[PDB]
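Re-run requested by the PI after the first attempt was lost when the workstation crashed. Everything re-entered from the original request form. Ligand of interest: magnesium ion.
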Amino acid sequence: SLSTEATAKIVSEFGRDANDTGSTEVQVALLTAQINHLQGHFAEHKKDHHSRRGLLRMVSQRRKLLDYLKRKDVARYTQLIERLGLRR
RNA sequence: CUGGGCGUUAAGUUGCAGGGUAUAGACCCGAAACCCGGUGAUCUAGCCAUGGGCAGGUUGAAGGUUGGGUAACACUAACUG
Ligand SMILES: [K+]
Ligand SMILES: [K+]
Ligand SMILES: [K+]
Ligand SMILES: [K+]
Ligand SMILES: [K+]
Ligand SMILES: [K+]
Ligand SMILES: [K+]
Ligand SMILES: [Mg+2]
Ligand SMILES: [Mg+2]
Ligand SMILES: [Mg+2]
Ligand SMILES: [Mg+2]
Ligand SMILES: [Mg+2]
Ligand SMILES: [Mg+2]
Ligand SMILES: [Mg+2]
């Protein structure tokens, strides 16, 4: 659902460089962008269970990446959740 | 018609008094009712407009705020109401 330009902007904003697409912060930011974007789609299409499964997969993947980041480096995790506006 | 029915050989009429009858309230008193035209919503029934009344003490719906909760809901606790 994210466009190429938006994906590249997120990668540049959260990674070490434009090639840092694999960092945990970049992945979590991309997942957050997709989840927030789909919120509008599921507000209108409440019975789109099949697509909602893919959304819930993004949510669980973000949770697992966040727990890994918190286990590894607490400061990076705190900065990332503050920047993204996530409760945890 | 041999006949048979009704008649012919018995004074009426007009007043006055009286007895009966008729039409009328017709010996007097007495219904429940029926019809016609009026008077009544100062009681009461409903409605309409315009004003008033309801000491004192309780219970604690929805809603709201904050926290928890959720990807977002949902949900949950306290306070408020
Ligand atoms: K005769
Ligand atoms: K006479
Ligand atoms: K008489
Ligand atoms: K009659
Ligand atoms: K009246
Ligand atoms: K009262
Ligand atoms: K309440
Ligand atoms: Mg993907
Ligand atoms: Mg006489
Ligand atoms: Mg007489
Ligand atoms: Mg009759
Ligand atoms: Mg009157
Ligand atoms: Mg009143
Ligand atoms: Mg009172």
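Saved to the shared folder this time. Residues 32, 35-36, 38-39, 42-43, 55-56, 58-60, 62-63, 86-87 of chain A lie near RNA strand B (CB under 10 Å from a C1').
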